[PDB]
Ligand binder design. Structure first.
Ligand SMILES: Nc1ncnc2c1ncn2[C@@H]1O[C@H](CSCC[C@H](N)C(=O)O)[C@@H](O)[C@H]1O
Ligand SMILES: Nc1ncnc2c1ncn2[C@@H]1O[C@H](CSCC[C@H](N)C(=O)O)[C@@H](O)[C@H]1O
Ligand SMILES: O=C1c2ccc(O)cc2O[C@H](O)[C@H]1c1ccc(O)cc1
Ligand SMILES: O=C1c2ccc(O)cc2O[C@H](O)[C@H]1c1ccc(O)cc1
Lengths: 358, 358
């Protein structure tokens, strides 16, 4: 009946999702335009003309800059303000100021995420979607990227004709790992009362080095495969140890599992977690395991956060056929391991730091 | 100080925008997968397996279907439910049901928008974004599509090697104009008390035909250029008249300006509006002008709607260098024309029907 009526808010819901990609493209444009850097360097609200002047735009592109700015401002990446104006011409003009979100676009700052936005929205990241239909209906098990190009993402980046793309990718990854320092500074409480720590899968020690920049007195042990640690000797508080995390992990007050469980199924992840609990048993109820990975909480009140996490989960699937765990999956893993409780702390926009206790 | 601290919710805001495109790709996948049609045809909640069965997916793609479904469900395009299960195997399974938004994906229904979602998210609509940086920094005034391909969007669609793309585009346009019928049925109040109506730029009469399907007694006059109307004769309530809307418009109780002012600057739009007021003067304070176009209300409480409108405005700019007016621009136009008041009614998700009064 009147149900057939009301072209509902169903139509508006449908359309908002159809055109959501635009918000991503507008943001991408803001970083490639270097708007944040221009405003930051001006050290004061910038006018449309001043900004157009700083970007050395052709007069015909000014109105395009304006359109992108209006949308970005509405989306909270810039704040509009009012300024007077020099000379006897003109009258009253609007100026633009950065906001916390856009300040993350200021290059040369430990907080700059420009490289990640550039790569996550590079043609090599997005063009494959045109092969989505063919991807669902084929008999071949492969990533969406492989279905669209015929080669894995990694092989693509390592082609001579993709030299710059690979460097773009490694810039983003290096920038991402760098953000871990911010995580440490922002959650000192987590490592504060520790005397020792073992960085599992710590490789050559890059992560423990950041850890030391914040906690120079913490005794850290970089645990990894015999071939990775090999020679590497340390200092008073730096230690390198080789072994197999599936058999055992060096004892310490805390065990760090940074982006480790991510690459393992439940069976393998449980064994690591169990060896982790055993590596801290000596410390009793004072020991702890620190997991740094993504946790998708569907029952979360922040629908937007969960959506972003799920979005990112869909990228992992299409690009690598990878996966991220939900809060539940984590809980099942944590308790199956024998731990008593746990606490999740949101970090880096949508990642999670999990404190697990015996 | 501690301001430097807090990697704020700035990071989460930044990332939510980076990955917004995923929601658009997931929706696109839902339509190409024909999920809505499969559920609709089943006439009852469908299980993951049943749905995988209906789509004839290779067993390895089932888990991919599941991942897309989880995200789409979170985004409100499907609703999760619980069903029992036949035979002695199994236990308890989740089923999926459509929601108002996904029902707009059921093909063969006057409400189907599948074709629009397909085109708006086709490679020909999205791939050009890789040329955005070059587009801002060049000296040539052209659309982003022209900058990326070297040819206008229209010329592209009319190439022999793009035969199917053009038909895809015309399917969406035909589907869009068809939705106008829903607008009429949903806003009878607007045309109810009218005796006569003049459809300006009505072409060969396609719009007046839909109008008659709902108001068979309304005397309609299809006004357009002499060459367009030409021969065309009508009936008792159908009338064809040729002329120049910039010089004058046939008198009637109401003047319909459906997607007309959109293609004209303020100077030309004002003249049309003035001729429109004169075409209804005879009816006095009872006459009205009906404008069907987009109106972007920045001060609107529905931030999401404005964003969508701005998003769509950015597509018009990149694809055609076109533009949409804001509520203010409309008000300035309406009053400069001499009208007393106006009312805006939201239609088709993000469009607007404007009632203007003398
Ligand atoms: N059996 C095993 N025991 C210990 N480390 C192992 C292992 N098998 C693989 N690895 C290690 O797994 C590591 C994954 S890299 C994980 C990321 C890292 N913690 C960071 O912060 O960047 C590699 O360094 C690899 O050498
Ligand atoms: N001076 C003029 N007077 C009347 N119509 C004109 C005109 N110049 C152009 N047009 C008409 O402008 C129309 C734009 S098409 C507008 C869309 C139409 N009302 C719909 O509902 O689809 C064309 O049909 C064209 O013939
Ligand atoms: O940061 C990311 C990213 C950065 C640059 C690039 O060119 C592609 C990308 O893909 C994703 O968008 C994302 C990513 C995250 C983790 C990972 O291991 C791989 C990619
Ligand atoms: O519906 C639209 C659309 C449909 C199919 C297609 O292949 C491209 C498109 O571009 C936009 O996404 C949108 C549009 C709207 C009005 C218009 O005049 C042109 C395009």
């Amino acid at each position: 009946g009147s149900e057939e009526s009301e072209l509902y808010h169903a139509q508006i819901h449908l359309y908002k999702h159809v055109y959501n990609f635009v918000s991503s493209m507008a943001l991408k444009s803001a970083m490639e335009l270097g708007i944040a850097d221009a405003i930051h360097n001006h050290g004061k609200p910038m006018t449309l003309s001043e900004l157009a002047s700083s970007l050395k735009l052709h007069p015909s592109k000014v109105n395009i800059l304006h359109r992108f700015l209006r949308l970005l401002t509405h989306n909270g990446f810039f704040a509009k303000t009012i300024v007077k104006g020099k000379e006897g011409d003109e009258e009253e003009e609007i100026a633009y100021s950065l906001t916390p979100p856009s300040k993350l676009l200021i290059s040369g700052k430990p907080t700059c995420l420009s490289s990640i936005v550039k790569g996550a929205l590079h043609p090599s990241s997005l063009d494959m979607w045109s092969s989505s239909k063919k991807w669902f209906n084929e008999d071949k098990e492969q990533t969406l990227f492989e279905c669209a190009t015929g080669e894995s993402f990694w092989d693509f980046l390592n082609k001579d004709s993709e030299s710059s793309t690979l460097s773009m990718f490694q810039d983003a990854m290096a920038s991402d790992s760098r953000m871990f320092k911010l995580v440490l500074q922002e959650n000192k409480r987590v490592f504060e009362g520790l005397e020792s720590l073992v960085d599992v899968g710590g490789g050559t020690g890059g992560v423990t080095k950041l850890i030391h920049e914040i906690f120079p007195h913490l005794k850290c042990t970089v645990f990894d495969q015999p071939q990775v640690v090999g020679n590497l000797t340390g200092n008073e508080n730096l230690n390198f140890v080789g072994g197999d995390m599936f058999k055992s992990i060096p004892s310490a007050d805390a065990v760090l599992l940074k982006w480790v469980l991510h690459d393992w199924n439940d069976e393998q992840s449980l064994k690591i977690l169990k060896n982790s609990k055993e590596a801290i048993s000596h410390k009793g109820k004072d020991g702890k395991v620190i997991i740094i990975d993504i946790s998708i909480d569907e029952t979360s009140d922040d629908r937007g956060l969960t959506e972003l996490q799920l979005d990112y989960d869909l990228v992992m699937l299409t690009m690598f056929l990878g996966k991220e765990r939900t809060k539940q999956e984590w809980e099942k893993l944590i308790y199956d391991a024998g731990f008593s409780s746990y606490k999740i702390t949101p970090i880096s926009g949508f990642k999670s730091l999990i404190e697990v206790y015996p």
